[PDB]
Design a protein around this ligand. Sequence first.
Ligand SMILES: CC1=C[C@H](O)CC(C)(C)[C@H]1/C=C/C(C)=C/C=C/C(C)=C/C=C/C=C(C)/C=C/C=C(C)/C=C/C1=C(C)C[C@H](O)CC1(C)C
Ligand SMILES: CC1=C(/C=C/C(C)=C/C=C/C(C)=C/C=C/C=C(C)/C=C/C=C(C)/C=C/C2=C(C)CCCC2(C)C)C(C)(C)CCC1
Ligand SMILES: CC1=C(/C=C/C(C)=C\C=C\C(C)=C\C=C\C=C(C)/C=C/C=C(C)/C=C/C2=C(C)CCCC2(C)C)C(C)(C)CCC1
Lengths: 84, 742, 42, 222
Amino acid sequence: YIGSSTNLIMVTTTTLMLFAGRFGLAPSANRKATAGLKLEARESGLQTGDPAGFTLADTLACGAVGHIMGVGIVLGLKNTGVLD
Amino acid sequence: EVKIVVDRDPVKTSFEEWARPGHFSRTLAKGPDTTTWIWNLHADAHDFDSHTGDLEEISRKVFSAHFGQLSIIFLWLSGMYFHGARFSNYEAWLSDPTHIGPSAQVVWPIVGQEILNGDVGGGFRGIQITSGFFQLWRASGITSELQLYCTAIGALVFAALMLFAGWFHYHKAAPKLAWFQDVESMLNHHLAGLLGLGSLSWAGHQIHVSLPINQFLDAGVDPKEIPLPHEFILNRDLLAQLYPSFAEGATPFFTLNWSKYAEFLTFRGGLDPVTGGLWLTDIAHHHLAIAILFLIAGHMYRTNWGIGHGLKDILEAHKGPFTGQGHKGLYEILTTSWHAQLSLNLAMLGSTTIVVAHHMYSMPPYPYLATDYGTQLSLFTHHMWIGGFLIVGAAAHAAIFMVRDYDPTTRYNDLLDRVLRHRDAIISHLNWVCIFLGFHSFGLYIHNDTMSALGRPQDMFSDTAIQLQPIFAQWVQNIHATAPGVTAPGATTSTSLTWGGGELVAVGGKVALLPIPLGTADFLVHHIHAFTIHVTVLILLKGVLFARSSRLIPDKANLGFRFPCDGPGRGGTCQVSAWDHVFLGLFWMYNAISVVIFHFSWKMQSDVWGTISDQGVVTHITGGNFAQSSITINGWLRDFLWAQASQVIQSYGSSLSAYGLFFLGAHFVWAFSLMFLFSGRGYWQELIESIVWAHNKLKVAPATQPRALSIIQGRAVGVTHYLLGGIATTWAFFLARIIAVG
Amino acid sequence: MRDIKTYLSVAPVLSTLWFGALAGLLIEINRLFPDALSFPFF
Amino acid sequence: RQLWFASKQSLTYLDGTLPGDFGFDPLGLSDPEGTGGFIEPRWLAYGEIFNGRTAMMGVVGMIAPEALGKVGLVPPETAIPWFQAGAIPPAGTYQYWADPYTLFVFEMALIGFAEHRRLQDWYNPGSMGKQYFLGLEKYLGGSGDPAYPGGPIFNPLGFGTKSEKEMKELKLKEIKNGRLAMLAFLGMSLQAIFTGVGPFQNLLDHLSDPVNNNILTSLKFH
Ligand SMILES: CC1=C[C@H](O)CC(C)(C)[C@H]1/C=C/C(C)=C/C=C/C(C)=C/C=C/C=C(C)/C=C/C=C(C)/C=C/C1=C(C)C[C@H](O)CC1(C)C
Ligand SMILES: CC1=C(/C=C/C(C)=C/C=C/C(C)=C/C=C/C=C(C)/C=C/C=C(C)/C=C/C2=C(C)CCCC2(C)C)C(C)(C)CCC1
Ligand SMILES: CC1=C(/C=C/C(C)=C\C=C\C(C)=C\C=C\C=C(C)/C=C/C=C(C)/C=C/C2=C(C)CCCC2(C)C)C(C)(C)CCC1
């Protein structure tokens, strides 16, 4: 049961969320978005091994949001079988 | 950032003070030169903000007080569970709950009160109860007195633990300011931590213990040989026998094909004919979804990390054209004055209590609850009363905040400033609306009664005469009855049964719910409710808005929150303090609640409750005369107030006789209140003077110089006695009537 | 210790215990003499 | 200080006082603005030491009997998983040289004696070597720090010969072995809660058959 709908959806959503974080397309730990635009990065003080300052919080928050958006886009499975 | 900073051992646990009353107030600690001292002592005990000037100490004090409150609540729960264990017939009640009266209190045979232990069935004698615990204890599958016993023990343990925690946190490790004043993490937790995980763990306890044992009992088994709860989780094969899907461990959940669990988590709706209650599958799905919702909500605000919002970063953005600068700085007001928070929370809590009261009857959650009439009725009216009291308290403390801790120099705001800048317009327009509603909602009753007593029925306000139709309510009911067709396919029936579509649910020859039609009488009663609510709002809002300074007295605030008057000058200035505004509004809130609960009782006993025949003909408890006798006050006397007051008045020499006795004392106090509400003081002062003379003549004049109560305390004792009389009267009436007939 | 003594001598608690004792005496008399209407001693 | 998932609230108090500070604390518990009782950094090092030591002893002991039963000569009368030994009644039991409950309260009283005395030492260091103890008095003074008691009762062979460096090595070893034993214990217990067959038999399994990979099944059963 690997590589199927659930697998591909979850992995692509979480990987694109993490990339949006690490490349500057997500308002992660050291980036707070205003009313409109996003690129307002400011520091929190959570130096970690990541070269772009990614603590063990944003790398978890982005994952949680990716999994939520995945579950939501997949459990609208009204066109790929209501039971898998 | 945010840390665990606290302080060590401010105050020592020394009894040095208990022997010196009023240690907190400098004046009180001097000594009781007169008798008003011992009133003023109790009167300002809990008044923490008048004992210091810094918020740290009063915050510590309220932190300890909350523990005291929780200890009392735990002790009460323990007493309840104990009396259920050692003194109830709970097992016999579980045997068959159709026609066995829940009793959980026996009385000692000493002074002839043996009659109190009336016949309740099931080989038991005891004062019948209406608290409604038994439906809960059957929902949670207690089904054994050992469980009640051990639960009472654990509750006692938690009570002592909370009392300890209290003592320790005030005396030994007192929290500091930057802890209290840090609301971000508090919101974060209480959203995610307390409520969410609470509902989640309860969904646990329901899907793993309640659901199977309840389904077994519905199948019909003596609870003696019903398998114990833990023996439903240890050995899987039982639940396997019940639910095929449930024998698949955790694969169907993690692998996102949740539909397998569809059996025990579903979205049926409606009620369950086996017990009239809710399909426990539905309530489990509810609690679980709510848990998930609270957990995902809890992660809003930045606390220590770099993600999340800040409650200061949310308000100041909102600033519209008309109002101007918006909510700037409001964050500081609601973080630097406890009374503000107390008012806000009391208002929201009263509203939630009211909506709980409403949603209870129309959607009976528990099983075999919509057929124990008295329980449903008593629960609803109790919740209504609690909500009303909470709302009035909210208004009072809002006024107190307005007086003391409001100041534009440092606790500034540009929104409340505008609000206060045009108070007169608000109060004027609300007053006019109150007059309009009063006229067009009570004069209608007066006209109807008069045109009745004048032999002109065809000029009345009813369905058979000049007609007023509540069209919007019937519109909404039609929509709710046709919504499960297209809008909400995932449902099975309407959300409840009270919507104007479907069939009726009846268990044990009695009905529980069925459609509810609305007649012109409902229109009139709804407008009466609207009017009375508007008038109470008028009173309390005027008090709050004018607590600072009125166009009558220019510097009212300087005179303080609670003072009797400003002398008889300028034509008399009686009852100008916001405190007196609350004193007034209390009566009107009482009246609103009273008429609401009377309407509820009559409507239920005239259109829903009752018995069902073998063939299926319904004969309601009162005969269905609402839509034809609620439209005349004389009717209210005749059809409802007089008639349905029989069972309380013949109640002497029976089990219910206690309900009879109160029906007089309730009235009596009720009288008594007038003596304080009408008279003044100077008269009583002179009378006390002459009595002091009569005593002093015999060398008995006490050094605790007698003094007639101060004005404010007179009004307070009056209003308390009056509320007590009214509520006790309606209480005795309700209980006697419903538990006798029903 | 003496502080708790002076506290115990404060009228509320003293009154509560006194009234409890009196009520106990009365209810015990009523138990040992049910309905006790007249004075059937002299 | 090999930084693995650190933060700044960690470095507020984790300034290198514990032997071998690695810098791993996102939450920042023991911030010294207000010293929380039992959140004291001294108490934290004490706790990690004590926990890791207990975990070492437990991971040896819980696994010892059945394991030894494999190709050894401890009889099959005790060839039982640690989680089936009897501590977990829903798993197994055994007829012992007493009854279950009184045995438990008795061992609780003994461990209570030991740890109460140790705690009293913690509050007042050295203060056990005053009162009558039917002997044993001239030993329980310790080596000053309740963290490290020393004493020929607890220093028989004699190490850290004339040194603090040797003590630093031996001791790093202590923290590392404590953490490793913690991991192994937690893993054995999680397998036990999810596998249901026993650790040593799980090794019996994972020696030959690679395809096991029971994270794929995630089967949650007793
Ligand atoms: C580092 C860090 C950092 C950041 O900041 C955060 C975080 C991440 C959170 C952290 C982490 C941590 C950790 C991992 C920890 C771990 C711990 C443990 C595991 C412990 C154990 C611990 C453990 C323990 C005590 C245990 C012990 C045990 C024992 C003795 C045993 C006993 C027994 C036996 C013999 C057998 C029988 O039949 C039964 C019994 C009775 C069972
Ligand atoms: C490249 C690289 C890297 C990276 C990698 C990666 C990419 C990783 C990933 C990672 C990840 C991938 C992570 C994740 C995370 C996730 C999470 C953490 C999730 C969670 C989830 C949850 C918690 C869920 C929840 C829920 C439930 C349970 C039910 C209801 C619904 C919901 C959904 C809410 C490294 C660093 C190595 C190094 C450098 C290089
Ligand atoms: C024996 C005696 C006497 C007399 C007495 C009397 C005559 C009394 C009366 C009394 C009256 C003439 C009346 C009364 C009434 C009472 C009441 C009325 C009470 C109540 C209480 C309560 C406690 C209630 C409660 C409640 C309710 C029911 C409602 C709301 C809720 C609650 C639960 C809070 C003499 C002087 C010879 C001597 C001394 C002793």
